[PDB]
Write a protein that binds this ligand. Structure first.
Ligand SMILES: Nc1ncnc2c1ncn2[C@@H]1O[C@H](COP(=O)(O)OP(=O)(O)OP(=O)(O)O)[C@@H](O)[C@H]1O
Ligand SMILES: [Ca+2]
Ligand SMILES: [Ca+2]
Ligand SMILES: [Ca+2]
Ligand SMILES: [Ca+2]
Ligand SMILES: [Ca+2]
Ligand SMILES: [Ca+2]
Lengths: 356, 197
């Protein structure tokens, strides 16, 4: 069996190739005293630790803490011996060459993996949608990326980035639920905000009409029941929170929203291929899960697209984990064993064989 | 049926002896030289769509990238696509996918103590056995498909609150529906005690 680890900025997804879902999902956080605590324990021990994200905007930045992530992935969450399994890693858009030799070197010399491979998250999600060509909107926990892909190859010059994703939406939802008169300080109370985010929020088709509807009645209010029978009541906050993706000014960001960054990404590709990207907008990542987001994207890219351009937004049902599921298929396909990098080649060519 | 068609079946490409019919539950790679078509059935699964797309790029890079890849949505085929075949048609065939639902044996289950001293809520792993459930704390039994919140007779109201919430997050992480079961010490069902080895 092979192992698939999809390392994100906020969440590690890991499991066995062939599984339809990742069986280990834990925060990509390491906490050191103000010798190390990793994952959920790091979060839970928030009051007395310094929490660092080793991956920022999908790129690995703290290597020491990343090995503690990987150590924790292997030994604490899946309880496997990495010496036993080929391991498939994923990588962000624009990941520098040096980072990924370092992913390779650590894999073979620290964890003694028999074989490995590094796949690109955006292409995995695109293939998983049934496409070799498209523009992926990848909205995760810490970063939102527009990744144009032409026949299997991302166009690095046209890739756009929005320093905004699920963790800012959680924080913003916490802020405005506080303005309703609630408090979220303990670990359990912070999970309630995030649980409310993932269950009751939505992207409105037309924002200002939704605000009017929310003001003139309690039609859109919804109640979140707490274990002790309490109720947390939420109104226009359901759609004000993910609206941030389209109006980054809600959190003080002077940036274009996700619809504009999609249009800007397409417009930076050659005129010949924009027709294929306008018609193949694929959503992936945990923050593309809000009900209503595709219909909203469709309406907004239609408003920015040239006349007679065909616009299609695809939001596959499994996009929460589409990167990881893609890697589960890849590492489980007879046809792919060719490009497993065995320890033998790394002994000969060094870390530089990964680019090849 | 002039062009060469590879029918996706169970993570492999089987080339048909007589192309033309396309199953709504499946995926196909239509190889016509400098043009390569992904026919994607509307009820196909993610493993099938994936191999189709990945194989196409491999076929395309096999021919120095000169080939043109296109995607066809099944049931909305362009007329020029259908005329590629002597008599094209649509069927309800569906070869099952390769990806499996994860299943856990009882001995893979994990038990977790939830204890709050006064300042912070602890979450620790404890040996997997009935003899680990102490009456003073709340214990969370992760049974993959089932999550049990075991409330000791002397647990704090906040340990039962918090332990309940982290059960909700177990269910949020995990695909499908997980049954969270709040059980009282001295009232726990047979099915709970069976979830230990
Ligand atoms: N149903 C849902 N609705 C809204 N947001 C969700 C939902 N489920 C998960 N999320 C959010 O998605 C985020 C995690 O997604 P993902 O794993 O794709 O991000 P990542 O890979 O950790 O980060 P990045 O992709 O930015 O590097 C979390 O913020 C989570 O709250
Ligand atoms: Ca990610
Ligand atoms: Ca988890
Ligand atoms: Ca099928
Ligand atoms: Ca080509
Ligand atoms: Ca206690
Ligand atoms: Ca669930």
């Amino acid at each position: 069996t092979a192992l698939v680890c999809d390392n994100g900025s906020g969440l590690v997804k890991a499991g066995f190739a062939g599984d339809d879902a990742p069986r280990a999902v834990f925060p990509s956080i390491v906490g050191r005293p103000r010798d190390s605590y990793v994952g959920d324990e790091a979060q839970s021990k928030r009051g007395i630790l310094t929490l660092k994200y080793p991956i920022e905007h999908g790129i690995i930045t703290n290597w020491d803490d990343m090995e503690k992530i990987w150590h924790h992935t292997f030994y604490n969450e899946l309880r496997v011996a990495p010496e036993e399994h080929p391991t498939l890693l994923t990588e962000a858009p624009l990941n520098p060459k040096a980072n990924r030799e370092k992913m390779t070197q650590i894999m073979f010399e620290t964890f003694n993996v028999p074989a490995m491979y590094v796949a690109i998250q955006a292409v995995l999600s695109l293939y998983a949608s049934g496409r070799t060509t498209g523009i992926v909107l990848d909205s995760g926990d810490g970063v939102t990326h527009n990744v144009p892909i032409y026949e299997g190859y991302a166009l690095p010059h046209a890739i756009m980035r929005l320093d905004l994703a699920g963790r800012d939406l959680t924080d913003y939802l916490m802020k405005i639920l506080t303005e309703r008169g609630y408090s979220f300080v303990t670990t359990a109370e912070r999970e309630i905000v995030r649980d409310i985010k993932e269950k009751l929020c939505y992207v409105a088709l037309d924002f200002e009409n939704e605000m009017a509807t929310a003001a003139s009645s309690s039609s859109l209010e919804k109640s979140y029941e707490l274990p002790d029978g309490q109720v947390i009541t939420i109104g226009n906050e359901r759609f004000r929170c993910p609206e941030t993706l389209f109006q980054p000014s809600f959190i003080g960001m002077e940036s274009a929203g996700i619809h504009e960054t999609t249009y800007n990404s397409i417009m930076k590709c050659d005129i010949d291929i924009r027709k294929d990207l306008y018609a193949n907008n694929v959503m992936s990542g945990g923050t593309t899960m809000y009900p209503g987001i595709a219909d909203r994207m469709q309406k907004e890219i239609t408003a920015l697209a040239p006349s007679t351009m065909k616009i299609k937004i695809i939001a596959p049902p499994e996009r929460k984990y589409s990167v990881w599921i893609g890697g589960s298929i890849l590492a489980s396909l007879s046809t792919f064993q060719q490009m497993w990098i065995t320890k033998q080649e790394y002994d000969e060519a060094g870390p530089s064989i990964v680019h090849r | 049926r002039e062009p060469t068609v590879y029918h996706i079946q169970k993570g492999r490409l089987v080339k048909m002896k007589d192309p033309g019919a396309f199953g709504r539950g499946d995926c196909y790679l239509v190889d016509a030289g400098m043009k390569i078509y992904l026919w994607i059935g509307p009820k196909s699964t993610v493993d099938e769509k994936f191999l189709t797309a990945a194989t196409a790029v491999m076929s395309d890079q096999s021919r120095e990238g000169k080939a043109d890849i296109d995607r066809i949505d099944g049931g909305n085929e362009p007329a020029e696509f259908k005329a590629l075949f002597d008599d094209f048609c649509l069927t309800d065939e569906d070869t099952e996918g390769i990806l499996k639902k994860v299943q856990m044996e009882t001995h893979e289950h994990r038990l977790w103590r939830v204890h709050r001293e006064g300042d912070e809520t602890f979450f620790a792993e404890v040996d997997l056995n009935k003899n680990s459930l102490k009456s003073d704390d709340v214990y969370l039994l992760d049974a993959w498909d089932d999550i049990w919140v075991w409330r000791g007779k002397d647990a704090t109201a906040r340990e039962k609150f918090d332990g309940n919430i982290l059960a909700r997050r177990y269910d949020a992480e995990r695909v499908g529906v997980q049954e969270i079961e709040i059980i009282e010490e001295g009232q726990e069902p047979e099915e709970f005690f069976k979830s230990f080895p």
